[PDB]
Design a protein around this ligand. Structure first.
Ligand SMILES: NC[C@@H]1O[C@H](O[C@H]2[C@@H](O)[C@H](O[C@@H]3[C@@H](O)[C@H](N)C[C@H](N)[C@H]3O[C@H]3O[C@H](CO)[C@@H](O)[C@H](O)[C@H]3N)O[C@@H]2CO)[C@H](N)[C@@H](O)[C@@H]1O
Ligand SMILES: [Mg+2]
Ligand SMILES: [Mg+2]
Ligand SMILES: [Mg+2]
Ligand SMILES: [Mg+2]
Ligand SMILES: [Mg+2]
Ligand SMILES: [Mg+2]
Ligand SMILES: [Mg+2]
Ligand SMILES: [Mg+2]
Ligand SMILES: [Mg+2]
Ligand SMILES: [Mg+2]
Ligand SMILES: [Mg+2]
Ligand SMILES: [Mg+2]
Ligand SMILES: [Mg+2]
Ligand SMILES: [Mg+2]
Ligand SMILES: [Mg+2]
Ligand SMILES: [Mg+2]
Ligand SMILES: [Mg+2]
Ligand SMILES: [Mg+2]
Ligand SMILES: [Mg+2]
Ligand SMILES: [Mg+2]
Ligand SMILES: [Mg+2]
Ligand SMILES: [Mg+2]
Ligand SMILES: [Mg+2]
Ligand SMILES: [Mg+2]
Ligand SMILES: [Zn+2]
Ligand SMILES: [Zn+2]
Lengths: 98, 81, 127, 214, 25
RNA sequence: CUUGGAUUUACUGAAGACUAACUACUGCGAAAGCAUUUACCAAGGACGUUUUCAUUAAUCAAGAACGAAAGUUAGGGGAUCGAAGAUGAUCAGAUACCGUCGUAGUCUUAACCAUAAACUAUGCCGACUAGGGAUCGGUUGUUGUUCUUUUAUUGACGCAAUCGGCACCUUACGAGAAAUCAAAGUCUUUGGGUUCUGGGGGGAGUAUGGUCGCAAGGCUGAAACUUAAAGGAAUUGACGGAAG
């Protein structure tokens, strides 16, 4: 039977959407279907942000961030626990987890 | 609302309706009297004019067509007939 | 003040490179990889090997006159992963704790403007 | 077997007078011998140094300048402007979602016949009282904004030499005037000259360069 | 068996018969 | 593959592709599809219209135009990926999954092919039946808002209406076997117009004839025989090298 009203993607009023390669396994996945996470991580782990700041030649130098947008196919994302299996009624909820 | 006077709509809500969806369709456009600033000459101009109308006296554009109502140039005053 | 080189750190998921050049990059001062510190292929990119690599890199630098370095971290990039390998953060931390002073830090991962086709095929690498 | 570092001679790099702290740092090369001079093999090198270091202020931390050496005067390297670029993290921090990105580039030569390509970038600005989620400009307006960017880069480069233009880049005169020129088109933010490339250089004039070094 | 491959098998076999029938042409 | 200096680093050059981030339950197109800038060429929907013609229309066997990818013919190009082929591993065996090379192909110009889970698995035209908030395009009235330039005739935003779109949420008057459905409702209280298809499962999209194609194949398309089931949705359980 039909599992999702969105068909597991985000294609409405469109014929074709260009693919993307999964970061983890390089599988071709449609851009609307790909599980996308935008990550802005600190480049230095919080343990080391002090001693490198003491070693800095600059007084009051702000550490740059690491910007990356990751694309996963459905098999990689489920396996990597990026998305999880939800209940039949809980699948419909599409707000970001708080 | 099941019971309602369809024959006598409130004129306020009747005016918010699309022009073809009233009881009797009626245009919302009109005709205007354009006074150019330069001279004094009555020139009848349609509100939704598609032409850059010029008055007979001086070959000066009175209005410029837009997507909807025509935009009168500066110094031209209109009065709806 | 100090005399700067540039520590161009390439941290992939199979190895970790600590390569210190001058400002131009045409002169190499020290290049130690995580694979020169271990005899197992499986941990060439380990944080432990990268820290050891930085200490030898750091050790070679003082005797040449490099007292401080700028950091240019990169991942594999290209069509492959853009996230840095596990060894890039430890080799950077080792440099700061090894007496070398740190200046500017930048990510120099090569990022394509769409790019050529990526290896693996349509269905990806099936495991 | 030889410790090739015994044969290296250190030289000091001096930046052009457009910047403040011309003492960038030190470099090395194989020592000058009878067969090969160190000077000829030492010229043409390019150093990428953050503009915040060349000016002291940390406000220029996201721009990086390429300085190209084309004369050596003893142990000093007399460099010139070679290019502009943004840091990767700064540029990545401006491209957010729910806004429109507009870019333009133009190839233009300066008064002294320096051919450059200058890349401009801008983003739609969200007004303080705006409620809707996104800030998108219609495609017709972006075409006018892109066109307006181009005529300013063309105008503000062809009327001046490379040295004056370098002095133009530090306070972002072109990016702010472009922002001024597009106010009646669309509100814009983070209008930047994000990259400059040298394509062609005029026939070398050492006298013009020495004037850029004191 | 899989429907696409069952279909492929008949195609190779239809092709053979046509070549086989051509002998008496 | 590497002391014949591999990998790495900076500068420079050359080739082909590809247009990242911005990029969305957003846009356009009959569908397939379409994403760098600019110029040119001819199109197009919607909106606005107190313009014009007055039934010119709706749907349509036959017949036409277009039709992803792969594939065919002949040139050109051939960076990257990569059927076939070759290899290193794994395995009891592995012609595979994984790794390394790699030929056609992938690109382009002229022609062919006419098929996809070509999907919304949901024909088109017309009418009616219910609330809400978003969003794209156009039009029409109005701001404690920012800005041109100092303000208007700048533009943006904000508030109201409206027509058209891409969708979404709630409810069930109603439908349905249910999953679910604002259409899949207005169907035993059974008739607005019209086109196509199906009649238990296999055999079988097989054989044969015709027709199109260079071919691969496309379109049309049986029968003998065999069989009590095959199947749909949902429930409980059992199981899972799925998650918590
Ligand atoms: N209100 C939801 C839908 O709005 C439709 O009509 C709406 C649209 O025509 C128009 O909406 C505009 C839209 O054009 C465009 N995306 C701009 C604007 N953000 C939208 O309008 C919005 O404006 C504000 C919120 O900003 C609200 O007060 C308003 O209700 C909302 N529709 O305003 C109308 C307000 O209702 C239809 N009425 C109907 O499909 C439904 O009611
Ligand atoms: Mg299922
Ligand atoms: Mg459409
Ligand atoms: Mg499709
Ligand atoms: Mg698996
Ligand atoms: Mg089938
Ligand atoms: Mg782009
Ligand atoms: Mg759009
Ligand atoms: Mg439309
Ligand atoms: Mg094709
Ligand atoms: Mg082909
Ligand atoms: Mg090739
Ligand atoms: Mg290969
Ligand atoms: Mg093989
Ligand atoms: Mg079919
Ligand atoms: Mg589909
Ligand atoms: Mg359909
Ligand atoms: Mg539906
Ligand atoms: Mg079908
Ligand atoms: Mg609107
Ligand atoms: Mg619902
Ligand atoms: Mg039904
Ligand atoms: Mg039957
Ligand atoms: Mg048979
Ligand atoms: Mg079932
Ligand atoms: Zn994947
Ligand atoms: Zn007049």
């Amino acid at each position: 039977p039909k599992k999702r009203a969105s068909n597991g993607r985000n294609k409405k009023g469109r014929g074709h959407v260009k693919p993307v390669r999964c970061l983890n396994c390089a599988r071709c996945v449609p851009k609307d279907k790909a599980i996308k996470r935008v990550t802005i991580r600190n480049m230095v782990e919080a343990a080391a942000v002090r001693d490198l700041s003491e070693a800095s030649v600059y007084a009051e130098y702000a550490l740059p961030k690491l910007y990356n947008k990751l694309h996963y196919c459905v098999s990689c994302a489920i396996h990597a626990r990026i998305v999880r299996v939800r209940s039949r009624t809980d699948r419909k909820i599409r707000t970001p987890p708080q | 609302v099941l019971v309602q006077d369809l024959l006598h709509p409130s004129p306020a809500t009747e005016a918010k309706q699309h022009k073809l969806k009233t009881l009797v369709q009626q245009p919302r456009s009109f005709f205007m009297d354009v006074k150019c600033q330069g001279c004094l000459n009555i020139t009848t101009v349609f509100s939704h004019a598609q032409t850059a109308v010029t008055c007979d006296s001086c070959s000066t554009v009175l209005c410029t067509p837009t997507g909807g109502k025509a935009k009168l140039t500066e110094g031209c005053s209109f009065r709806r007939k | 003040s100090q005399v700067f080189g540039v520590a161009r750190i390439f941290a992939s998921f199979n190895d970790t490179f600590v390569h210190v050049t001058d400002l131009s990059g045409k002169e190499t001062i020290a290049r130690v990889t995580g694979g020169m510190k271990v005899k197992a292929d499986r941990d060439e990119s380990s944080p432990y090997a990268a820290m050891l690599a930085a200490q030898d890199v750091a050790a070679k630098c003082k005797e040449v006159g490099i007292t401080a370095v700028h950091i240019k971290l990169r991942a594999t990039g290209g069509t492959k992963t853009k996230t840095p390998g596990p060894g890039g953060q430890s080799a950077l931390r080792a440099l700061a704790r090894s007496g070398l002073r740190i200046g500017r830090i930048e990510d120099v991962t090569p990022v394509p403007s769409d790019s050529t086709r990526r290896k693996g095929g349509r269905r990806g690498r099936r495991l | 077997v030889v410790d090739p570092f015994t044969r290296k001679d250190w030289f000091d790099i001096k930046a052009p007078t457009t910047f403040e702290n011309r003492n960038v740092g030190k470099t090395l090369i194989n020592r000058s011998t009878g067969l090969k001079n160190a000077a000829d093999g030492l010229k043409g090198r390019v150093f990428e140094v953050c503009l915040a270091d060349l000016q002291g202020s940390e406000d220029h931390s996201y721009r990086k300048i390429k300085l190209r050496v084309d004369e050596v005067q003893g142990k000093n390297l007399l460099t010139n402007f070679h290019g502009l670029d943004f840091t990767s993290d700064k540029l990545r921090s401006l491209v957010r979602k729910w806004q429109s990105l507009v870019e333009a580039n133009v190839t233009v030569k300066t008064s002294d016949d320096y051919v450059l390509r200058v890349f401009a970038i801008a983003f739609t600005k969200r007004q303080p009282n705006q409620i809707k989620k996104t800030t998108y400009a219609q495609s017709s307006k972006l075409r006018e904004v892109r066109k307006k960017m181009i005529e300013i880069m063309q105008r503000e480069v062809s009327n001046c030499t490379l040295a004056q233009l370098t002095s133009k880049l530090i306070p972002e005169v072109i990016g702010r005037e472009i922002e001024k020129s597009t106010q009646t088109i669309f509100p814009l933010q983070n209008v930047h000259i994000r990259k400059v490339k040298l394509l062609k250089q005029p026939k070398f004039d050492l006298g013009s360069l020495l004037a850029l070094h004191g | 068996m899989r429907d696409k491959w069952r279909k492929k098998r008949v195609r190779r076999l239809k092709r053979k018969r046509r070549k086989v029938r051509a002998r008496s042409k």
